[PDB]
């Protein structure tokens, strides 16, 4: 999909930063590489490869022109001057390194942004090989872009030398499209939600080293660079046996050493630095730039304040956590500063130091010259670059002479090396690996809060921690609001007939626990700010097995009913105790009684049936010595993560406008023809059977309006929802060709069927008086099964409606039901 772009392109924030800092001597600031080929460079081939390279990476042709102080960036067409190629013969000089350097430096300052092409070349010829110089202005290339250029040139040169036409890989999204993409993202509400974060990162300035106030503008001519290194032994410890202490990365240790060094000399536990990101991860789902050539570097500040904490074991954790809390990898700050132009953002203090860790690591031996001008202004007095060349960490320290003296910077570099060694030895000698809140998936937990959760659940390994779903949160809030501690219990008794191996049933039961993590979850609401699901790794639940075969069935039933009464009396204390309890008692040889109790938070009735079915399937596979066949279970955390993904402020808007205004049972069976007739009416109107029956109930309510309907809550766009275990059941209110009109009412709420009823009625005038009732629509061993106003309807050949009320009025309810479901059909 090769294309070509031409015309105005918006300035990316990195480009806008370049023009703001550099107002004079902006002509030459380049990215230069020297290459050596033993057999020599064919002048015909190199000028043809670069001709195709430039028109394939359209950023290289762009031009920056000025109009009364404003900068307009234009992308030139392929027909204009693409590059300048110069060829030199330094074979006979006998002082080639001197001659090539002076030639390369002169050509490196010849770039005119307004007129000249931004790519210029210099081929040097020697009797012992040829050298090619590639100079590209930094406004159209970065570190990753040159890696792309090298691959295309290597493929292009090899294939062109073999006679074939040059054809590169298909072009990705243009830099012009990328610039317009981030500019559109500049006014998105998602980015503007990060203003308070970046305000904190720039609110205060760090004194750091003693700086000369009269340094003026920091420049390249006033900047010196020296490097310090760690020996191989200590560098080996950092790479291998350091990250294991707290599950950190190499960048965490180096940044921590920066704070430790500043802590020892400045006395403050606060440090502000600027970090460089490659800026190639898409901010919003859309344009990708995997192969696009351009300047995608994104700079953002990070301000770390540890208060009074000096225990460096704690320091490493909270420094790692602070780096884990940067939103969108820091791309937001650059967009917010230059594309949104927030005045508060533009007034932040300058970061005293710029830090960047490149990572781990034919080429020519001749220098390419100075790639930057002496008049180029640099916004950071200090720059630190850390690289491991062979096996040793080389710390390249760049400082401005006018800002800091040489001895001061070398002193800072030396004790930063000492501070780094202090951090390395602390992690190397660490015995046990300490997990961090970001490692558990929830970075909203403080270090102390995690320790209390660990302390509360001591003796148990925590697997994952994530917040409760809004369905679970509503359940817990009225669970603490004691409703006699009876509405939160789901207790059933299921007897089964057959010969059961006790260990296999327990093992099959435990395999269910591992399969569904929510059953192993314990609710935490006191330690954390919000209720949070704490999942224990090896949390088992004991299936207490008592035989009691040798007694009368009436005597057995007395013990069975006593246990059902006794365990219901116990309740759920939520004191770090499992919320699932099951008992297996053996009435006789092939007749058991299995009772199951659970808290409403963990699962619903739909999930309850799934567990029983999976338990039935897996156990029989155990008997046959054949592995079970079953779909992979999707974690309940994925649904919660999706739930937190989409915003529900519009969901609140949806419901607020919608709302503007002794146990007895009875069974009603209708003729099969009557049930069949209304089903035909639903099909002809393209209206669901749920919708048509809602209208028939709604019209009656007008004579006595909005009523409550129970929904599975399993329509979310998460894979495997229908077969995953969790709390998805919900009751939602519905307000009432009429069947067609409310048919689209159901689909409008389909997107917003995820919030609890208690918060929906808060948007209503009647509040708790909104709903008076609910409407419900429905060799081994074998199974067998044994509000105060709810209505249940069961479809089938004959319509059956079961109504429970906690007397002749009931007859009147039935009589009017059948009389009104007759006139409309005819």
Residue numbers in the entry: 4618 to 4978, 4988 to 5287, 5307 to 5349, 5355 to 5386, 5396 to 5437, 5454 to 5461, 5469 to 5488, 5494 to 5513
Sentences from the paper on this structure:
Nonribosomal peptide synthetases (NRPSs) are multi‐domain enzymes that catalyze the biosynthesis of therapeutically relevant natural products. The communication‐mediating (COM) domains facilitate interactions between separate NRPS subunits. For unknown reasons, COM domains co‐occur with epimerization (E) domains, are partially embedded within the adjacent condensation (C) domains and can also be found as internal cis‐COM domains. We present the first crystal structure of a cis‐COM domain within an E‐COM‐C domain arrangement from modules 4 and 5 of bacitracin synthetase 3 (BacC).
